[PDB]
Amino acid sequence: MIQQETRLKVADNSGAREVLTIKVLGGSGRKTANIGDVIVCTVKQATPGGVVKKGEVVKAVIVRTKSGARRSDGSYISFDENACVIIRDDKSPRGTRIFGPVARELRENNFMKIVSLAPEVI
Template structure:
């Protein structure tokens, strides 16, 4: 589990969407894992609860936000 600290790209950027790189703090980690609680890392947003509208009119929406550590 991670918490977003900053959305990269632009000086006053407030939000990140799918595909954006964010700076995160690790809040929960598995024992003997590569990352520890409190580490600051970069991650890529892969799912958002906010719906994504496609050019053909379809809408994609997920239950939770998710990111992959880089």
């Protein structure tokens, strides 16, 4: 459950360390985004020398959340943190590496490059 002002760790090597959520995308009054949803966000903390710089507005896909996600079989997945991956408009990650486990839900939304790069998909 990510909303305007939620800060997320960035689970990639794009240069951004922390982003602030500017907007949940996909409809007028949409309050909240979950795993596999895209957000507009500003980079609040960056790694020095990275591609993505502090202050850039960027799109990111959420790949883990504390709220987590329910599956049709009645099972759930939750993580210890909220994290996203900066993306281009075609869903490809701007970085080359993904850190930490991502949720299976990203396959469903056709974030395949992310799912392939992730060390674990739970």
